[PDB]
Design a protein around this ligand. Structure first.
Ligand SMILES: [Zn+2]
Ligand SMILES: [Zn+2]
Ligand SMILES: [Zn+2]
Ligand SMILES: [Zn+2]
Ligand SMILES: [Zn+2]
Ligand SMILES: [Zn+2]
Ligand SMILES: [Zn+2]
Ligand SMILES: [Zn+2]
Ligand SMILES: [Zn+2]
Ligand SMILES: [Zn+2]
Ligand SMILES: [Zn+2]
Ligand SMILES: [Zn+2]
Ligand SMILES: [Zn+2]
Lengths: 172, 104, 171, 103
């Protein structure tokens, strides 16, 4: 374990479990979880990876993911190629959380950091839950990695923090 | 050319927009830019431009109006009972903005 | 921890508590309530109860078979004398509340609670790897009358609604 | 003439037959009606002449095979080769597997 910092290469062998979106908003119909190779996907283009302590919880819901959902158009305009939301919750719960927020497509993906394996390796996990952090990546290299330690804060991991750091770069 | 003193409180996570300081003292112009008695609408506007220490203004005011999900209590009274945004502020009023949304 | 099978004729264990969000009448999954404690030991101490445990909320069998069966036959469970239906899982109280809403449950007909860290389920021997087993416990004025677990994945033969109804009609 | 086949019992069904999976049996190629032997006749034959457990509930229920038993004809689900009507042919294997899955 060591803190992941800007200028670092995003770690290798980072995989998440997730149910690819089918276009449905039906919470009662589960798909089939598969593997997502985050290291490979982030290797080209600009990526935004956000972790939340818990799906369906108040702040994680009413502030953090809502804020990103409200400004996809701004994120797209900024050149962001993919937005990922992870948590310790299993791939079924994460998929239902995405549906509950009206996400039917790949605009935001909802994946599981099983056993907080990735989050623990970068030092931002505790007691079976991921921390509240946000990583921005550009062609494999980390450009931003901050965790919100203050209870209820989204200052460092929220959408606006990601938009500002993006404005200091140019690519799609 | 007299002023009105008041105290404004921020709670429910709104305090994080003001470097975590809940209580603030403000002396308002008793008359606004059109010479009418100053109101909560003027206050909300003042707070968003002169008091916030966080750059995320949409967390408090959206499209020139207070963000939804914020209760406004005037001396412990819901501003819907006292007239919202049109209530003429009185001296030593206490105005409490509290977010019903968890966190910010 | 300590483990002792929970078997018919036993007193339901004391100090059994779950974490849950009381139903407010809303079906909005984006607005979450406030979890509180549910004293299962006290609630089950009077009247007929049906405590059903599931491995995982929002999963296929747990969803498409088990809970749907109980929801489909609440009228039949009510007519049989059941005073309360509890559904528990290791999922936290927020996820459980969202699962119940996703099934249209807005009232107390079925409560959706969390067996935190499988504390209760592990104490009766029906949990593993941080998830509860698929079991059902019928209780009547504090005393257990039926406690069976489904071992094979996909099976709701012992913990399903029809098992519980059959057990209730034999008294 | 008679016709030779092998029947297999798994998934717990074997316990109804001295805990024996495989059995070789020779059927009459024709029924009482005189029509070619079918799986339905076979199932009825097993329940009355091969089960060692008296509870026939456990294999056949009301003249048909109990639910929750897969029937494979030469390793093919009998839904693809005709159900209870497949005309039995020589050296045909019929596999009965009881499963709690699929509910
Ligand atoms: Zn480093
Ligand atoms: Zn549905
Ligand atoms: Zn979960
Ligand atoms: Zn500060
Ligand atoms: Zn101040
Ligand atoms: Zn007060
Ligand atoms: Zn109102
Ligand atoms: Zn009044
Ligand atoms: Zn109005
Ligand atoms: Zn106050
Ligand atoms: Zn709350
Ligand atoms: Zn009663
Ligand atoms: Zn039949």
């Amino acid at each position: 374990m060591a803190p992941l910092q800007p200028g670092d290469s995003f770690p290798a062998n980072v995989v998440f479990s997730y149910i690819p979106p089918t276009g449905s908003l039906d919470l009662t119909v589960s798909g089939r979880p598969i593997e997502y190779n985050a290291s490979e996907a982030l290797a080209k283009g600009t990526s935004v990876l956000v972790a939340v302590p818990g799906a369906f919880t108040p702040t994680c819901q009413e502030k953090h993911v809502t804020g990103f959902i409200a400004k996809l158009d701004q994120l797209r305009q900024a050149g962001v190629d993919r937005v990922l939301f992870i948590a310790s919750n299993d791939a079924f719960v994460m998929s239902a959380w995405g549906k509950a927020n009206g996400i039917k497509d790949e605009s935001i993906l909802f994946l599981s950091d099983s056993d907080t394996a990735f989050s623990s390796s970068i030092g931002w996990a505790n007691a079976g839950r991921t921390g509240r952090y946000a990583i921005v990546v550009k062609d494999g290299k980390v450009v931003y990695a901050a965790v919100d330690t203050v209870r209820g804060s989204t200052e460092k991991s929220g959408v606006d923090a990601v938009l500002t750091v993006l404005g200091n770069q140019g690519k799609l | 050319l007299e002023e009105i003193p008041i105290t404004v409180d921020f709670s429910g996570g709104l305090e994080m927009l003001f470097d975590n300081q809940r209580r603030h003292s403000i002396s308002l112009p008793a008359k606004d830019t059109e010479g009418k008695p100053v109101t909560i609408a003027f206050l909300i506007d003042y707070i968003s431009k002169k008091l916030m220490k966080d750059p995320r203004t949409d967390l408090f005011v959206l499209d020139n109006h207070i963000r939804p999900g914020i209760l406004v209590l005037i001396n412990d009274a819901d501003w819907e009972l006292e007239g919202e945004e049109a209530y003429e502020i009185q001296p030593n009023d206490n105005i409490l903005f509290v977010s019903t949304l968890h966190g910010g």
